[PDB]
Amino acid sequence: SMEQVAMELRLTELTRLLRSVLDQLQDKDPARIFAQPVSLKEVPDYLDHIKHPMDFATMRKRLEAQGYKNLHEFEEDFDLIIDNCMKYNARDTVFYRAAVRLRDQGGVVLRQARREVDSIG
Structure with a gap:
């Protein structure tokens, strides 16, 4: 259907906006502490400490x-990155x-992305 395609163009545009948001958030991590999953090796x-790892x-x-x-779903994942780190690592650590x-x-960045998503639909 035509509706399904219109929908798919909106998800594609949201994906487009979220990719820019992701790049902007990742620039705020120049040390690359959050770039990759915590190594289980x-x-x-x-996984005894952190039930839903993210990166x-x-x-x-x-x-x-x-x-x-x-x-909201994208923000949930971003919040996991931060919240997992703040539990596993003590206050006085570089992490x-x-x-x-x-x-x-x-x-x-997230404040303006919310306005842009609501604004542009």
């Missing part, structure tokens, strides 16, 4: 399969501090 107990490469794979239906900075900095 290097942190063998990780920017995993988000990108979902993104390119158009697996984000709306901004925890990097998460705080990414949250703070990403907030600005």
Whole structure:
């Protein structure tokens, strides 16, 4: 149908907007602490602590399969990256501090993406 195709053009455009959001959020992590999954070879107990691991490469794979239906789902994944880090790592670590900075900095980007999604439909 024509409706299904119109829908698919909107998801494609949302995917387009979310890709730009993702790049902007990832720039706020120049150390690349959040680029890749936590290694289970290097942190063998990780899944005993963290039930839903997340990272920017995993988000990108979902993104390119158009697996984000709306901004809320994309934000959920971003929040996992931060929230998992802040639990597993203590307050006085470079990792925890990097998460705080990414949250703070990403907030600005997410604030305007929400306006852009509502605005453009």
